[PDB]
Design a protein around this ligand. Structure first.
Ligand SMILES: *Cc1c(COP(=O)(O)O)cnc(C)c1O
Ligand SMILES: *Cc1c(COP(=O)(O)O)cnc(C)c1O
Ligand SMILES: C[C@H]1CNc2c(cccc2S(N)(=O)=O)C1
Ligand SMILES: C[C@H]1CNc2c(cccc2S(N)(=O)=O)C1
Ligand SMILES: [Cl-]
Ligand SMILES: [Cl-]
Ligand SMILES: [Cl-]
Ligand SMILES: [Cl-]
Lengths: 356, 361
């Protein structure tokens, strides 16, 4: 029953907002327009681009009671030629549909939404900044909207998309590694980008700050597996226990969100063929031995907001572990950053980019 | 640092809803008014009772993106004397504040919100039905309302309360027993998670699982946890087993509050009543499928049942454990204990017997 971009409805604002002045804080500033699509028992309605406006919801909306909500996060970059491109948007649409199905929310056509998103970004092109290291953040959302307190498959839903000009990497982060905090469980929904996975992390992150750390290192299992850092996937660049240099990141076994940047770093590294690229469980036990034996070169997080984020300290069992990421260049990090920048800003042509 | 009931602003409705005629569907019908209190950097605003209306929310509202939401559920009952009473509402206030603290949502004064809820139900008192087994379901909600995509402690929040006249939760509710799907592949909660808080995030993921129970011929989900398949909860209810234990003692057992169990008000009440009676052992202990399978084949199980505000005591007659279809003899055993719990709750709830558990409206 998918909505169609052909049926799009445009309604331009009466009074555009004054763009930012070359200090942009992430996700606070929004653009003039937004996409909105309604679903009900008659199926999907016509998508519309409309001025950025509030949502009107029935107070029993299942979005607000039973967390029938999921989101996405992706970026559009403006090249020198003032051309704007989305990075691997198809993977975000893929992941959004899976999230949708997990919450019994309505199915939709991935290319239709991608086209609607394209048009929306097209309409707000001038918001997309071109300054170094800047981008447009795109936040699609699908929430349920059943006006009743039954916990059930909804018969109403809203799909909408907002846009944020953003700025920001160079500086590393410190992590709190405390196993009392568990982000996701095998058989759970940690591998889907559902709102309910995030709310509970707010307190945990406050604890990390009180303990002088900047982010949370999410550990899993009795053997303390490194799963993710904050809202980022985790990569370790080391010489492994079998003497072979490798880039490792935990495998998609259910507690890991399959990042787009994660997959892209795996793709890039493999393409180079210069070292082993593997998806494997990483335990604190292995990390310690590797640190004491000097085999660790870099540790970083990956995610759309902070594409490659160096890690230099992990506070584990009340004692600080130094991570020599910044001493080792960080060569791999900077190399990852350089190529992604070349691709994203259109210096190198690449099928990963989708032009707006 | 809290709204005050003394500052309540009343805005009566100018378009009153037609009240239900002579068949209530749970959670679909709403009363004329609602409670509403906003929070921001200046603190709690003034509370208001206003006509039932839509919420206006910024599109980046942290309630919709990062699930900064929690809710409660409790009942008001009208006795034959027309006096309306709330069942142990203080426990709901206690639990709501714990949820709020877990999601870094703003604190409030439990006794002030309770008074505000009293004032709200008082306005809509004629919505409270009085037919047998009817009540008014009270749904408070607290949500974050930050118009920012950062995952962080909100600087804006929204506390509201809506009301539903209700009958039974499902047709033949609390009378006709239910069947459960017990598959270990499904996880509701985990130690170190937030399953022991009444947060919206715990419920959305269960919809698909409930569909799968229907698909396999069952009505509710028996949530198992751990290697040894512990019976945690049934649907949105706590689970109780009344049996003769392996040590030959007749006991009422329910899983303990170790992190994967939502501390139900009805649960606590059933434990309180049973322990007070002093007629049989009453324990909080984990319960495994192996213990249940073994207790069944030795004919030691009397009654298995769920508890929760919407279906206070819900009998269970069947459990599908993987491919093994298990018959639970709850109904052939009276269900003597279920009936006694129901009878005593009713007398307390509809004002037959004055009791410290009832808060008058
Ligand atoms: C969004 C997200 C990521 C990374 O996703 P990208 O698709 O690379 O932006 C990693 N972990 C978690 C928990 C996330 O929510
Ligand atoms: C609300 C709830 C219960 C029971 O709570 P009561 O306070 O007894 O209504 C049990 N389990 C879950 C998962 C719940 O959400
Ligand atoms: C649709 C309602 C039905 N009832 C409950 C809900 C949520 C949490 C607990 C319950 S309970 N404990 O009242 O069964 C949603
Ligand atoms: C404000 C944003 C910051 N970044 C992310 C958020 C949520 C989910 C994933 C991310 S990520 N993976 O892009 O860092 C919140
Ligand atoms: Cl791609
Ligand atoms: Cl996956
Ligand atoms: Cl009490
Ligand atoms: Cl608890």
């Amino acid at each position: 029953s998918s909505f169609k971009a052909a049926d799009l409805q445009l309604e331009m604002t009466q009074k555009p907002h004054k763009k930012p002045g070359p200090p942009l804080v992430f996700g606070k500033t929004f653009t003039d327009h937004m996409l909105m699509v309604e679903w009900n028992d008659k199926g999907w309605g016509q998508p519309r681009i409309q001025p950025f406006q509030n949502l009107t919801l029935h107070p029993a909306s299942s979005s607000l009671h039973y967390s029938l909500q999921l989101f996405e996060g992706m970026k559009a970059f403006k090249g020198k030629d003032q051309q704007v491109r989305l990075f691997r948007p198809w993977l975000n649409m893929d992941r959004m549909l899976r999230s949708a199905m997990r919450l019994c929310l309505p199915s939709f056509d991935k290319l239709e939404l991608l086209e609607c998103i394209r048009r929306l970004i097209e309409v707000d092109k001038d918001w997309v900044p071109d300054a170094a290291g800047t981008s447009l953040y795109v936040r699609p959302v699908l929430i349920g909207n059943e006006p009743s307190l039954g916990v059930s498959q909804p018969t109403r839903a809203l799909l909408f998309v907002i846009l944020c000009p953003v700025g920001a990497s160079v500086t590393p982060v410190s992590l709190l590694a405390d196993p009392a905090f568990i982000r996701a469980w095998v058989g759970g929904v940690g591998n889907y980008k559902l709102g309910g996975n995030y709310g509970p992390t707010v307190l945990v992150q406050q604890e990390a700050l009180k303990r002088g750390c900047e982010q949370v290192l999410w550990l899993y299992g009795p053997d303390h597996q490194l799963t993710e850092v904050g809202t980022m996937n985790i990569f370790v660049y080391w010489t492994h226990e079998d003497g072979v240099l490798e880039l490792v990141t935990p495998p998609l076994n259910g507690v890991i969100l399959p990042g787009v940047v994660r997959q892209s770093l795996l793709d890039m590294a493999q393409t180079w063929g210069e070292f082993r690229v593997v998806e494997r469980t990483i335990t604190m036990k292995q990390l310690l031995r590797a640190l004491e034996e000097g085999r660790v070169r870099e540790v970083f997080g990956s995610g759309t907001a902070c594409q490659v984020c160096p890690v230099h300290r992990i506070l584990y069992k009340d004692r600080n572990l130094h991570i020599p990421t910044m001493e080792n260049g960080p060569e791999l990090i900077l190399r990852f950053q350089k190529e992604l920048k070349e691709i994203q800003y259109g210096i190198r042509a690449h099928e990963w980019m989708f032009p707006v």
